[PDB]
Design an enzyme around this catalytic site. Structure first.
Site, PDB file in Angstrom:
ATOM      1  N   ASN A 125      68.869  52.635  66.294  1.00 17.27           N
ATOM      2  CA  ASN A 125      68.181  53.276  67.422  1.00 17.27           C
ATOM      3  C   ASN A 125      67.518  54.615  67.131  1.00 17.27           C
ATOM      4  OD1 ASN A 125      69.218  51.111  68.971  1.00 17.27           O
ATOM      5  ND2 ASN A 125      71.056  52.286  69.497  1.00 17.27           N
ATOM      6  N   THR A 175      51.263  35.059  39.768  1.00 19.76           N
ATOM      7  CA  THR A 175      51.155  34.384  41.045  1.00 19.76           C
ATOM      8  C   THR A 175      49.982  33.409  40.978  1.00 19.76           C
ATOM      9  OG1 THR A 175      51.902  36.425  42.176  1.00 19.76           O
ATOM     10  CG2 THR A 175      50.962  34.660  43.547  1.00 19.76           C
ATOM     11  N   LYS A 177      46.824  31.395  42.257  1.00 21.91           N
ATOM     12  CA  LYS A 177      45.705  31.770  43.130  1.00 21.91           C
ATOM     13  C   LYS A 177      44.698  30.619  43.189  1.00 21.91           C
ATOM     14  CE  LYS A 177      47.346  35.928  43.627  1.00 21.91           C
ATOM     15  NZ  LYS A 177      48.204  36.319  44.780  1.00 21.91           N
ATOM     16  N   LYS A 179      45.529  32.301  47.061  1.00 24.25           N
ATOM     17  CA  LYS A 179      46.835  32.479  47.722  1.00 24.25           C
ATOM     18  C   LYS A 179      47.223  31.241  48.523  1.00 24.25           C
ATOM     19  CE  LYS A 179      47.926  36.367  49.705  1.00 24.25           C
ATOM     20  NZ  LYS A 179      48.864  36.913  48.690  1.00 24.25           N
ATOM     21  N   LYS A 203      54.711  31.860  39.816  1.00 26.27           N
ATOM     22  CA  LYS A 203      55.331  31.885  41.137  1.00 26.27           C
ATOM     23  C   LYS A 203      54.425  31.378  42.218  1.00 26.27           C
ATOM     24  CE  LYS A 203      55.958  35.947  43.236  1.00 26.27           C
ATOM     25  NZ  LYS A 203      54.979  35.717  44.278  1.00 26.27           N
ATOM     26  N   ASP A 205      52.872  31.991  45.769  1.00 24.46           N
ATOM     27  CA  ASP A 205      52.549  33.183  46.544  1.00 24.46           C
ATOM     28  C   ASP A 205      53.567  33.322  47.693  1.00 24.46           C
ATOM     29  OD1 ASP A 205      50.953  35.522  46.940  1.00 24.46           O
ATOM     30  OD2 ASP A 205      49.148  34.358  46.484  1.00 24.46           O
ATOM     31  N   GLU A 206      53.779  34.554  48.146  1.00 26.47           N
ATOM     32  CA  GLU A 206      54.720  34.821  49.244  1.00 26.47           C
ATOM     33  C   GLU A 206      54.446  33.989  50.493  1.00 26.47           C
ATOM     34  OE1 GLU A 206      52.449  37.526  48.316  1.00 26.47           O
ATOM     35  OE2 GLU A 206      51.202  36.830  49.956  1.00 26.47           O
ATOM     36  N   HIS A 295      60.548  38.612  46.906  1.00 24.09           N
ATOM     37  CA  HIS A 295      59.273  39.228  47.212  1.00 24.09           C
ATOM     38  C   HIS A 295      59.504  40.141  48.421  1.00 24.09           C
ATOM     39  CE1 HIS A 295      55.245  39.576  48.939  1.00 24.09           C
ATOM     40  NE2 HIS A 295      54.789  39.330  47.724  1.00 24.09           N
ATOM     41  N   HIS A 328      60.262  43.156  43.702  1.00 24.66           N
ATOM     42  CA  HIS A 328      59.007  43.850  43.419  1.00 24.66           C
ATOM     43  C   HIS A 328      59.225  45.357  43.593  1.00 24.66           C
ATOM     44  CE1 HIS A 328      55.930  40.423  43.518  1.00 24.66           C
ATOM     45  NE2 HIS A 328      57.104  39.832  43.601  1.00 24.66           N
ATOM     46  N   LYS A 335      46.862  47.545  42.115  1.00 24.74           N
ATOM     47  CA  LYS A 335      46.183  47.629  43.418  1.00 24.74           C
ATOM     48  C   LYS A 335      47.058  48.164  44.579  1.00 24.74           C
ATOM     49  CE  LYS A 335      46.964  42.763  44.716  1.00 24.74           C
ATOM     50  NZ  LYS A 335      46.448  41.373  44.637  1.00 24.74           N
ATOM     51  N   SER A 380      53.770  43.940  39.867  1.00 15.16           N
ATOM     52  CA  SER A 380      52.814  42.913  40.256  1.00 15.16           C
ATOM     53  C   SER A 380      51.722  43.476  41.135  1.00 15.16           C
ATOM     54  CB  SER A 380      53.552  41.807  41.020  1.00 15.16           C
ATOM     55  OG  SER A 380      52.678  40.755  41.391  1.00 15.16           O
TER      56      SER A 380
HETATM   57  O1  LIG Z   1      49.872  38.449  46.739  1.00 13.66           O
HETATM   58  C1  LIG Z   1      49.628  39.262  45.799  1.00 13.66           C
HETATM   59  O2  LIG Z   1      48.740  40.157  45.890  1.00 13.66           O
HETATM   60  C2  LIG Z   1      50.489  39.129  44.550  1.00 13.66           C
HETATM   61  O3  LIG Z   1      50.787  37.726  44.376  1.00 13.66           O
HETATM   62  C3  LIG Z   1      49.788  39.635  43.291  1.00 13.66           C
HETATM   63  O4  LIG Z   1      48.633  38.879  42.954  1.00 13.66           O
HETATM   64  P1  LIG Z   1      47.726  39.385  41.699  1.00 13.66           P
HETATM   65  O5  LIG Z   1      48.675  39.306  40.533  1.00 13.66           O
HETATM   66  O6  LIG Z   1      46.600  38.378  41.623  1.00 13.66           O
HETATM   67  O7  LIG Z   1      47.289  40.784  42.058  1.00 13.66           O
HETATM   68  C4  LIG Z   1      51.834  39.849  44.740  1.00 13.66           C
HETATM   69  O8  LIG Z   1      52.508  39.183  45.807  1.00 13.66           O
HETATM   70  C5  LIG Z   1      51.745  41.361  44.989  1.00 13.66           C
HETATM   71  O9  LIG Z   1      51.727  41.997  43.711  1.00 13.66           O
HETATM   72  C6  LIG Z   1      52.905  41.949  45.787  1.00 13.66           C
HETATM   73  O10 LIG Z   1      52.835  43.389  45.791  1.00 13.66           O
HETATM   74  P2  LIG Z   1      54.138  44.243  45.380  1.00 13.66           P
HETATM   75  O11 LIG Z   1      54.521  43.791  43.989  1.00 13.66           O
HETATM   76  O12 LIG Z   1      53.663  45.677  45.447  1.00 13.66           O
HETATM   77  O13 LIG Z   1      55.171  43.960  46.440  1.00 13.66           O
HETATM   78 MG   LIG Z   2      51.643  37.270  46.474  1.00 13.67          MG
END
Ligand SMILES: O=C(O)[C@@](O)(COP(=O)(O)O)[C@H](O)[C@H](O)COP(=O)(O)O
Ligand SMILES: [Mg+2]
Lengths: 480, 138, 138, 138
Positions: A125, A175, A177, A179, A203, A205-206, A295, A328, A335, A380
């Protein structure tokens, strides 16, 4: 007039009404911290006219036993013990009305082994209190006696390296791509090409879970085919982070059990599933000999702004306790946000057996990790092999360097992209190990390796001048 | 194929001078060093054969280089690797492992597949070298 | 029947001097004292009705004896008990509870049985006093 | 005891003028109104007896007040309540329910307990009024 009126408490402390939190027992500058206490450091920004000690005492009170008016029911408990104490309130350097508040909480306030309970008190809170216009949790001291009630990482970096048979260098990953949008069979194609070309891992992607464009089972099936193809092609143990993130615990379990049945060395989960599902998965991963990658999806919603939220180092502590094997933790040069000294603090929090106070790294408490296993940091997002010297220097040897765009964006294909990254890594590691000033010589070390590696030459030509130079939002308050 | 186990296997086979520098590095960290060999290249062959005992408390890289040469006299036709171990609490594991000898030809692996339930398959990595008995593989 | 809840219910109903000595004892240990009453004698009636608030940090036994008397006057026909509470960590509970008033006649309980699976039964304790509404029981 | 079902039961029994103002409020919201009665005061007695049909599309509070009086002639010894219903999609439920008649004496409830597994108990709310048959309760 009645027996209720007659038996009213006349004592000044426990008579009805509102009194300041700093006069209710929640301010004690002479409090002797016990080695079993949970400590928290808050960055406190009071509203105009609010006293800094009173604001700090309010945070202490409303995160332990207090409410806004006096209650007689305090006296049914050992209240002197259960009240949290703000015990040190200091001005933050280079600010006008901002304070560091150190607060002590007795070990008996907390449920053993529960991140949900710890956070229910510490962050439940107090961030919404009118009287503080901003509040950030910067660090915590989790005592050894409370740490021993948690599993720690299911696998940890030591056992992870043993399972992978990979020592003395960072792991590599990528990751897949784009996404979203790929089919299961195309996912498997990318995984095969990346692993076969030199990466240790790829991996999901999230945000790749199960969707109209690709359902989860075919992805897992094609992914393990790709993995096993790549193992047979190289003689290395390889893995793909199968994402078991799902809406319900039963669905997550169904996905994790299937991945287990296929024989994956590794799965992943997203922070957005939340603490209880994460702890449940940490236990599952220990029981089922699985590397559990976390992640940190959504972490930057509260971790970005210096004046308000939760610093990521605290999340590192909670997730290490919860039982994840990777998290991570930043790149510095990629970036996403990442001040080098803050990142150093994060990596040390995840990897060290013991931390000393280090104000320039944002480590405010001495932290004994009680022999809990170590979390592998993951670097990453927006990184490329032209930065390999910087990555090895800022991030060290114990990390997964993940190159998504930096592998799959390679003009000569996914295998070439993977090979560039792997050669760049080994070239930099061998130079570091020989005693060379690899940071000063890094660009030349990479050029030399490129002389006998076309894929690396191409990657350097394409990306060498790509930088992400921006002012950090999350920075230290002290310097060396 | 090239077996890419080991820390430096995407780089060319290491010279004796490169190897000595890695040994010097290990010594500077007070890591124990040992030498192992195998003729089963399986990625999960965890226990390569020991060449003597690990060398603890090493002052001199030349002692390690001597044993590398001695192991090579007996086993340069097969795989030989150098490992470094750190017994600091919380590590207590290998911290460096690199290949120093390879066979002239590594045929690699057959990926074996078996049908299982629904679309699931069971997999096995079959080493072509292991088609022959130990002593006749490479 | 005699309801034998309470610390001293196998002794005769306590005299005012006996009660005062128990109060002095509780005061000497720095225990908080409260007074509670009920017309449901059930052994699992955990929450007898409060007579005001507990007395905390008590100096004077006469003050507690006054409230004991006052409750007895308003509830002379039903049960009344004195409890002492210790808020020391690891106790934080009642440490003494004894009856200071009882009805002139307690009819007690019917044991109710229901048939269940195989030879198992389910049991209930039915208070005869609760055959009538509150205020008409004793 | 006082049965504290209904929206206004911590306030004194409503006058006819107070009731008419609540009826006016319901009419102003275009809610349907009905009148129900019971001699089972159980908190989960969901279906009190209907006094006629609900009044839909009501212009005049006096029509409702007439039926309140008419219901009272037959049932003023027991509970009578007024309900308002809103059939707007997403509500389609009662939106107001208040008591307009009570018995002169409500004896209330015995809390019945039964032993179950370990420390668990099963509970029942026994209405003292229901000790007698309908027509003889109040
Ligand atoms: O979705 C993305 O952008 C990535 O798959 C990176 O892709 P790239 O390798 O193509 O950039 C990762 O999930 C991020 O790095 C997460 O950020 P952090 O590690 O800061 O949590
Ligand atoms: Mg990702």
């Amino acid at each position: 007039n009645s027996v209720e009126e007659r038996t009213r408490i006349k004592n000044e402390r426990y008579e009805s009404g509102v009194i300041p939190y700093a006069k209710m027992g929640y301010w004690d500058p002479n409090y002797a911290v016990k080695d079993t206490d949970i400590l928290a450091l808050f960055r406190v920004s009071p509203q105009p006219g609010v006293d800094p000690v009173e604001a700090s005492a309010a945070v202490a009170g409303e995160s332990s036993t207090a409410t806004w008016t006096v209650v007689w029911t305090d006296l049914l408990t050992a209240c002197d013990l259960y009240r949290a104490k703000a015990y040190k309130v200091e001005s933050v350097p280079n600010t006008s009305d901002q304070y560091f508040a150190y607060i002590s909480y007795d070990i008996d306030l907390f449920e053993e082994g529960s991140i949900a309970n710890l956070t229910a008190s510490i962050i439940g809170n107090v961030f919404g209190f009118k009287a503080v216009k901003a509040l950030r949790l910067e660090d915590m001291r989790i005592p050894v006696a409370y740490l021993k009630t948690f599993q720690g990482p299911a696998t940890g970096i030591v056992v992870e390296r043993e399972r992978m048979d990979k020592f003395g260098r960072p792991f590599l990953g990528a990751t897949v791509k784009p996404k979203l949008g790929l089919s299961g069979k195309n996912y498997g194609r990318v995984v095969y090409e990346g692993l076969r070309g030199g990466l240790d891992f790829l991996k999901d992607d999230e945000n790749i879970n199960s969707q109209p464009f690709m359902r989860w089972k075919e992805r897992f099936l094609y992914s393990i085919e790709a993995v096993n193809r790549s193992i047979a092609a190289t003689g290395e143990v390889k893995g793909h982070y199968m994402n078991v993130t799902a809406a319900t615990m039963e669905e997550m379990y169904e996905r994790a059990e299937f991945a287990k049945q296929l024989g994956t060395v590794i799965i992943m989960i997203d922070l957005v599933i939340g603490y209880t599902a994460i702890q449940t998965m940490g236990i599952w991963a220990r029981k089922n000999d699985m590397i559990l990658h976390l992640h940190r999806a959504g972490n930057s919603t509260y971790s970005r702004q210096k004046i308000h939220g939760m610093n990521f180092r605290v999340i590192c502590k909670w997730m290490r306790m919860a039982g994840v094997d990777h998290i991570h933790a930043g790149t510095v040069v990629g970036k996403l946000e990442g001040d080098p000294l803050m990142i150093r603090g994060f990596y040390n929090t995840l990897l060290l057996p013991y931390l000393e106070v280090n104000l320039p790294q944002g480590i405010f408490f001495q932290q004994d990790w009680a022999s809990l296993r170590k979390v592998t940091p993951v670097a990453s997002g927006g990184i490329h092999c032209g930065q390999m010297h910087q990555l090895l220097d800022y991030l060290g040897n114990d990390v997964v360097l993940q190159f998504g765009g930096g592998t799959i964006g390679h003009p000569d294909g996914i295998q070439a992209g993977a090979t560039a990254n792997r050669v760049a890594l080994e070239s930099m590691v061998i130079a570091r190990n020989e005693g060379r000033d690899y940071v000063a010589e890094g660009p030349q070390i990479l050029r030399d390796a490129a002389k006998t590696c076309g894929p690396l030459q191409t990657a350097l030509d394409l990306w060498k001048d790509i930088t992400f130079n921006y002012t950090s939002t999350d920075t230290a308050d002290f310097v060396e | 194929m090239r077996l890419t186990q080991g820390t430096f296997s995407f780089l060319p086979d290491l010279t004796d001078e490169q190897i000595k520098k890695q040994v010097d590095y290990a010594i500077s960290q007070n890591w124990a060093i040992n030498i192992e060999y195998t003729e089963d290249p399986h990625p999960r062959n965890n226990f390569w054969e020991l060449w003597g005992l690990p060398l603890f408390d090493i002052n001199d890289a030349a002692t390690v280089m001597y044993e590398i040469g001695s192991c090579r006299q007996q086993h340069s036709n097969v795989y030989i690797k150098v490992n470094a171990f750190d017994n600091t609490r919380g590590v207590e594991s290998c911290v460096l492992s690199f290949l120093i000898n390879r066979p002239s030809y590594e045929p690699g692996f057959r990926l074996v597949r078996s049908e299982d339930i629904s679309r699931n398959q069971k997999y096995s990595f079959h080493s072509y070298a292991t088609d022959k008995p130990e002593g006749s593989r490479y």
